[PDB]
A paper describes a structure:
We identified the arginine binding protein form Thermatoga maritima (TmArgBP) as an ideal system for arginine detection. Additionally, in contrast to the vast majority of SBP that operate as monomers, TmArgBP forms multimeric assemblies at room temperature. The secondary structural elements and protein organization in distinct subdomains (lobes) connected by two joining fragments confirm that TmArgBP is a type II SBP. One novel element emerged from the present study is that the protein forms a dimer through the swapping of the C-terminal helix.
The structure of the apo form was solved by performing multi-wavelength anomalous diffraction experiments, collecting data at three distinct wavelengths. The structure solution unveils the presence of two independent polypeptide chains in the asymmetric unit of the ApoTmArgBP crystals. An analysis of the intermolecular contacts established by ApoTmArgBP molecules within the crystals, carried out by using the server PISA, clearly indicates that the these two independent molecules constitute a stable dimer. Indeed, the total buried area in the complex is 1387 Å2. Similar to other arginine-binding proteins, ApoTmArgBP is folded into two distinct lobes, each consisting of a β-sheet core formed by five strands, surrounded by helices. β-sheets of lobes I (residues 23–110 and residues 210–231) and II (residues 116–203) present topologies β2β1β3β5β4 and β8β7β9β6β10, respectively. In line with unliganded SBPs, the two lobes of the proteins are far away from each other and do not establish significant non-covalent interactions. Indeed, the two subunits in the dimer mutually exchange their C-terminal helix (residues 237–246). An important role in the swapping process is played by the hinge region 232-KKSPY-236 whose extended conformation hampers the association of the terminal helix with its own subunit and favors its anchoring the main body of the other polypeptide chain. Using the program DynDom, we computed a difference in the closure angle between lobe I and lobe II of 20° for the apo form, whereas no difference was detected for the holo form. Indeed, the C-terminal helix of Apo-TmArgBP forms interactions with residues at the closed interface between the two lobes of the adjacent monomer, an interface which is not accessible in the Holo form, since locked by the arginine ligand.
Author numbering:
A (entry chain A): 1 to 226
B (entry chain B): 1 to 227
The structure:
């Protein structure tokens, strides 16, 4: 696959641009997002242009098998059923919701059932909003911005926040007064998919993911512990 | 504290240079190593020279408390007892063991108990040797060099290797046929110590550590999941 991509001069990436912030159409009409940036990095490393081929999500695996695309990068969860059909890269994104509480409390909810009888702050319209709104005995307070749901928690006016894992860990890393009490709920891991026989491109992609995840701290460890 | 450091023109870092590869004395009498490289980074970013004050490990906290040094960077484990006396930075080093296995396998041990009934390669007399040798049902295969323990694993002659997280990570980075299957098996971490009153210097040190730990992936997360 790699020689054919390099000869053609562009990488064909299938996605369905109706999944912000992974892939979506911005105010300028461009397809952008977290997954699009990984696709752009892979194409740059291969020395080729990126050609996005947008289609419905259910079209992506058939397109890959028909060779109309080289790779799928589209918020695609690695599952056993998909593994029978396509090869995935190492997981590149851990999806799901978590429950955040004050570190100095005793309260350690593990599930939405543990939040019955409590006040929970969520960001309007998000998965956490939709989930907690199923539970009539949760007192739900809704915020335009997730930062203000955390501020409500910090002030003791909510008992917990529910938010996606990536965003919540990023925030809690900056706010040592909060802690993630649950595991990741409805967890999924996303993978980059490529035809089973195209193991050259698969291992190239696993190499780019490794690189993206290496920090100067990792390089320092390599310097002194090799 | 920062104004005073900059006025003086040098950062005083205390350490005990008897702990390779964290801090030790090289062939030419220079004090070098992982911790020294962190100290040099911090001094560079403050715009000052680094002045290492070498002393015995038990002398470090008293030297800090009597203001003979600005900071300790010396393989110092964060403990509740020391937290009563000094302020620590974010943890900057996980000292515990990890378990390494072949990637093309379903075997993903998480604990020493998961290695029971398996064959584990180790470097002779290291922590990993000492720790696994406690478990009766583990067949232990011992080598003078950790590289040969990994070779035993790669060759299919052992099911896993146990090694400190840092050396395992450095090796696995160049050997994608292997994976670190466990978290760190114990929770000891090193921290950079400063005086509790020196909160500007502590915040500056944390900002250096945080930036060192940021990968391009972390920056991409920040790009797409911020507000």
């Amino acid at each position: 696959a790699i020689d054919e991509i390099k000869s053609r001069g562009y990488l064909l990436v299938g996605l369905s641009a109706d999944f912000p912030p992974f892939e979506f159409v911005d105010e300028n009409g461009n397809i952008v997002g977290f997954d699009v940036d990984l696709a752009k990095e892979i194409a740059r490393r291969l020395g080729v242009e990126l050609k996005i081929v947008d289609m419905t999500f259910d079209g992506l695996i058939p397109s890959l098998l028909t060779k109309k695309i080289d790779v799928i990068i589209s918020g695609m969860t690695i599952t056993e059923e998909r593994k029978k059909v396509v090869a995935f890269s190492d997981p590149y994104f851990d999806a799901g919701q978590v429950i955040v509480v004050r570190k100095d409390s005793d309260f350690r909810p593990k599930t939405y059932e543990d939040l019955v009888g409590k006040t929970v702050a969520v960001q309007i319209g998000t998965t956490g909003d939709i989930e907690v709104s199923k539970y009539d005995g949760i007192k739900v307070v809704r915020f335009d911005k997730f930062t203000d749901a955390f501020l409500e928690l910090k002030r003791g006016r909510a008992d917990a926040v529910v938010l996606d894992s990536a965003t919540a860990r990023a925030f809690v890393a900056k706010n040592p007064d909060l802690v993630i009490s649950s595991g990741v709920l409805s967890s999924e891991q996303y993978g980059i998919a490529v035809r089973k026989e195209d193991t050259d491109l698969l291992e190239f992609i696993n190499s780019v993911l490794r690189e993206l995840k290496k920090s100067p701290y990792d390089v320092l460890i390599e310097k002194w512990f090799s």
